[PDB]
Design an enzyme around this catalytic site. Sequence first.
Site, PDB file in Angstrom:
ATOM      1  N   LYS A   1      -4.061   4.734  -7.378  1.00  0.00           N
ATOM      2  CA  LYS A   1      -4.685   4.951  -6.074  1.00  0.00           C
ATOM      3  C   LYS A   1      -5.284   6.352  -5.980  1.00  0.00           C
ATOM      4  CE  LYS A   1      -4.841   3.255  -1.788  1.00  0.00           C
ATOM      5  NZ  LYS A   1      -4.705   4.372  -0.781  1.00  0.00           N
TER       6      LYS A   1
ATOM      7  N   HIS B   1       0.785  -1.224   0.000  1.00  0.00           N
ATOM      8  CA  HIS B   1       0.000   0.000   0.000  1.00  0.00           C
ATOM      9  C   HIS B   1       0.830   1.295   0.000  1.00  0.00           C
ATOM     10  CE1 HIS B   1      -2.620   3.124   1.705  1.00  0.00           C
ATOM     11  NE2 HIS B   1      -3.628   2.451   1.177  1.00  0.00           N
ATOM     12  N   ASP B   2       0.836   1.969  -1.154  1.00  0.00           N
ATOM     13  CA  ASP B   2       1.374   3.340  -1.335  1.00  0.00           C
ATOM     14  C   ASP B   2       2.826   3.528  -0.911  1.00  0.00           C
ATOM     15  OD1 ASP B   2      -1.290   3.488  -1.949  1.00  0.00           O
ATOM     16  OD2 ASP B   2      -1.652   5.378  -0.883  1.00  0.00           O
TER      17      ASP B   2
HETATM   18 CL   LIG Z   1      -2.516   6.639   3.606  1.00  0.00          CL
END
Ligand SMILES: [Cl-]
Lengths: 279, 279
Positions: free
Chosen positions: B120, B33-34
């Site tokens: 995202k 995630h990111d």
């Molecule tokens: Cl975040």
Amino acid sequence: KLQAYALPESHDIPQNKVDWAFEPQRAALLIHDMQDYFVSFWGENCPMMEQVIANIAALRDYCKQHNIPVYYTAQPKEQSDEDRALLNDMWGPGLTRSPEQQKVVDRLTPDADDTVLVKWRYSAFHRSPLEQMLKESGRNQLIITGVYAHIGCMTTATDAFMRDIKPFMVADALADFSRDEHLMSLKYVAGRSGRVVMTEELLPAPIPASKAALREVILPLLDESDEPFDDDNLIDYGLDSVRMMALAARWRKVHGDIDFVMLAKNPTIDAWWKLLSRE
Amino acid sequence: PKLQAYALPESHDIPQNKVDWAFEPQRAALLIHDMQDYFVSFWGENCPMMEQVIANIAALRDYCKQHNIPVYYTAQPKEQSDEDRALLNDMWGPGLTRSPEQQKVVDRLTPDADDTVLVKWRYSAFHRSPLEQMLKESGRNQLIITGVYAHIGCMTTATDAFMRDIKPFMVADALADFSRDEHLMSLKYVAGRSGRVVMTEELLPAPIPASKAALREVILPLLDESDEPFDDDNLIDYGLDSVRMMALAARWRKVHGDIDFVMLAKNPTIDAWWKLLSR
Ligand SMILES: [Cl-]
Ligand SMILES: [Cl-]
Ligand SMILES: [Mg+2]
Ligand SMILES: [Mg+2]
Ligand SMILES: [Mg+2]
Ligand SMILES: [Mg+2]
Ligand SMILES: [Mg+2]
Ligand SMILES: [Mg+2]
Ligand SMILES: [Mg+2]
Ligand SMILES: [Mg+2]
């Protein structure tokens, strides 16, 4: 059982990242999962819950009067294993084994001009027409009230935010499992997803909550270069006597005995605050 | 804002989970995630905590790619109009969009063509994304969550997964956050509200026997003799079929490269093998 706690006050709201001013014409009200099964976890006649409900009712009355749509979420009595899914693992049967407790609490009873949505998940937007109802009506602000603050209310807030809707979490029109959890939900929204406000901040003319607030109602009604002291005659300071008719009528909603005479015989910020204070 | 390292959560820092879904490799996927230079460089160059976080994610992705578990990255786009970015501008200002040079996933987690990179747009990996659909078609209903920031994007993705009938496994020591408190709160939140919280080590295959007692427990069921051997007893005397040493050496060759059939067979005892595993 859940135990009652002290509801948050203005100073308990952390500074919000965003600044969004409340726009009545762009807003809708959400009354989140205020069913019997959920408020009955505080037991009978809980004063913290009676405060919460009274606040939601105040907001709802204002909204209906001002053409702000009111939405409820209600979790359905019958939920198949496929539909309930992982919620069975997390909470067990929930309300589904108390189907008689599915109605919205008495004092928040919907009428036909409100919208009641079936609630399947923490977010009021999931598996519901909520996003589309709001966008179609031109509403991009959602006032959030109900139980439980850190779970469904906070999730709906984040979800709204992601869907370009500005959440307004109402600090004292929410309850939670615990005070820490309730306060965390406010810190979360204030920093990550929207505005957190007090009920009185959304209402156009609430009763002065402090003597400071009372001065704030009275001061623009005076013609003067100098502000009066709290024990100064307000008529000496340019107050039109006729204003006391509207003031009394507003303040009768709390104390049924306050009239023009009671205000007029001693027209001071000191005397009037003393009148509004009495329990 | 900016950020300083803190003490990563250990096994005892994980709060008791409400659910007990066993991890199933064949049903799982990994979200990274990111993990972009922009977000990670807020900790500064050569951060020992972030180096540990990246190392656990890397270990998880190696295990996944080797065992046919799909790996997904979410990456926030450089190009973000005011319409698309919407309220995130109000909340965060420009974010990464002012940094063309900091857009790529961190060097050590570099994706290849066999992974999936998702644009995202919001906190939840599922929003404005083909993630849920991609997962359903592949029979994957478990999602391993790793990366930054734990209580924001990762926690929202977990809750959104849970709502979309996907089992979140939040990886305690494979996340980082703005602060340790917000990191730890996100673990408590998932644990009681949305899924499993685990340590990196719990998802990876059992490591080399941590103790000689652990080694003995591996071995005893492979023996036929009514009685238990001493640590210096010849294990083949005890009913160990020699072929078993091939499967044993191959597993231990992952830590100590020199361990082959010859090295074990020349001295088939619990004492001698533990000496090999202990160097
Ligand atoms: Cl975040
Ligand atoms: Cl809830
Ligand atoms: Mg009207
Ligand atoms: Mg009733
Ligand atoms: Mg005084
Ligand atoms: Mg006048
Ligand atoms: Mg410790
Ligand atoms: Mg393979
Ligand atoms: Mg690079
Ligand atoms: Mg909690």
